[PDB]
Design an enzyme around this catalytic site. Structure first.
Site: not given
Ligand SMILES: [Ca+2]
Ligand code: NA
Ligand SMILES: [Ca+2]
Lengths: 57, 223
Positions: B40, B54, B84, B175, B177-178
Site C-alpha cells: 500500500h 532527523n 501487503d 507514517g 507503514s512499510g
Molecule cells: Ca536528515
Molecule cells: Na539527530
C-alpha cells in the site's frame, strides 16, 4: 448521498500520504492524511482533481 | 510510533524513509540495492532516504537514492490487504559501512511472545497528531494468531500477524507503514494496518515476512 459531503477517511493502513478532500463547511478542497488503503471517494491526488469533482458541493 | 522512545541517531541502520516530496512510508534495507516495504506504500516517484535520523534536517549521513523499480506482490489485495509487501530496487547501490546496513531475512517464523523492535517516523499520538523529527522505536511482542483474529474477526489472513499490547498505548501509526518489525536480528514484519493506533484490544497488524522469503529472494534475483 453526495460523497463530496462525507468526512475525510484516513483508513486502517499506516502510511502518511497527503490527499485532498472537499470540506463542504469551508467550501474548499483541503489536505488530510490518507493511510494508503481502502479510500473513500472524497479523496483526491490534487487540489485540481478535488475542485473538478466536488467544486460547489 | 505511539508510546515509544527516541532510537538514537542511526541505531536502526536498516530503517529507510520513502519520500515523495515528503515522508510517507518506511522500509527495510535487505541488501545494497533492495528495500522491503508495504504494497500500500506503492507511490509514484519514490526516493529512498537512507542513513536518516532527523527527517527534516540534513545531518551528514544521508543517502538519497531514487527507486528504479517498485514490485508490488502479484497477489496483493487492496481490499483485504492480503500480501501487503513490496520490493523496491535502488537506482544505484547504497553505500554500506555502521550507519547504513541491511537486515537479515528470517529462516523461520517468530513465535508468540517474541520481543521485537518496531520503528518509524509515524504519528506519536493515539488521539491527535504529532509527527517526530527523529526516528522512534518501540519494543513489542508477537501476539498469537488466536488473539489477533479475536481482535479483528474475519480480517486476519495467514499472511498477517498482530504485535503489541492489548491494554493500548504502544503501537505503530500513520507514517510507519512499510517499516520494520525486527525480532532476534531478523525482519519478521512490515508495518501494515490496524484499527486506529494504540487502541485497547486493537494491536497493530503486520505482514508476515517469513511467508515470503523464497519469493523475495527469487524476485530480487530476477530484477
Ligand atoms: Ca536528515
Ligand atoms: Na539527530
Ligand atoms: Ca487544508
Amino acid at each position: 448521498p453526495d460523497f463530496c459531503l462525507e468526512p475525510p477517511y484516513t483508513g486502517p493502513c499506516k502510511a502518511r500520504i497527503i490527499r485532498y478532500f472537499y470540506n463542504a463547511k469551508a467550501g474548499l478542497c483541503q489536505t488530510f492524511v490518507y493511510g494508503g488503503c481502502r479510500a473513500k471517494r472524497n479523496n483526491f491526488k490534487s487540489a485540481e482533481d478535488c475542485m473538478r469533482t466536488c467544486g460547489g458541493a | 510510533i505511539v508510546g515509544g522512545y527516541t532510537c538514537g541517531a542511526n541505531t536502526v541502520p536498516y530503517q529507510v524513509s520513502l519520500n515523495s516530496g515528503y515522508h510517507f512510508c518506511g522500509g527495510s534495507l535487505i541488501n545494497s540495492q533492495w528495500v522491503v516495504s508495504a504494497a500500500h506504500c506503492y507511490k509514484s516517484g519514490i526516493q529512498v532516504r537512507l542513513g536518516e535520523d532527523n527527517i527534516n534536517v540534513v545531518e551528514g549521513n544521508e543517502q538519497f537514492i531514487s527507486a528504479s523499480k517498485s514490485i508490488v506482490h502479484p497477489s496483493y489485495n487492496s481490499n483485504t490487504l492480503n500480501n501487503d509487501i513490496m520490493l523496491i530496487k535502488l537506482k544505484s547501490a547504497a553505500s554500506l559501512x555502521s550507519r547504513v546496513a541491511s537486515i537479515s531475512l528470517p529462516t523461520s517464523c517468530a513465535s508468540a511472545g517474541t520481543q521485537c523492535l518496531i520503528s518509524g517516523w509515524g504519528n506519536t499520538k493515539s488521539s491527535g497528531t504529532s509527527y517526530p523529527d527523529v526516528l522512534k522505536c518501540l519494543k513489542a511482542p508477537i501476539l498469537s494468531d488466536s488473539s489477533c483474529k479475536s481482535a479483528y474477526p474475519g480480517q486476519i489472513t495467514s499472511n498477517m500477524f498482530c504485535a503489541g499490547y492489548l491494554e493500548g498505548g504502544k503501537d505503530s501509526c500513520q507514517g510507519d507503514s512499510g517499516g520494520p518489525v525486527v525480532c532476534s536480528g531478523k525482519l519478521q514484519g512490515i508495518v501494515s494496518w490496524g484499527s486506529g493506533c494504540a487502541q485497547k484490544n486493537k494491536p497493530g497488524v503486520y505482514t508476515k515476512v517469513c511467508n515470503y522469503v523464497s519469493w523475495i529472494k527469487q524476485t530480487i534475483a530476477s530484477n
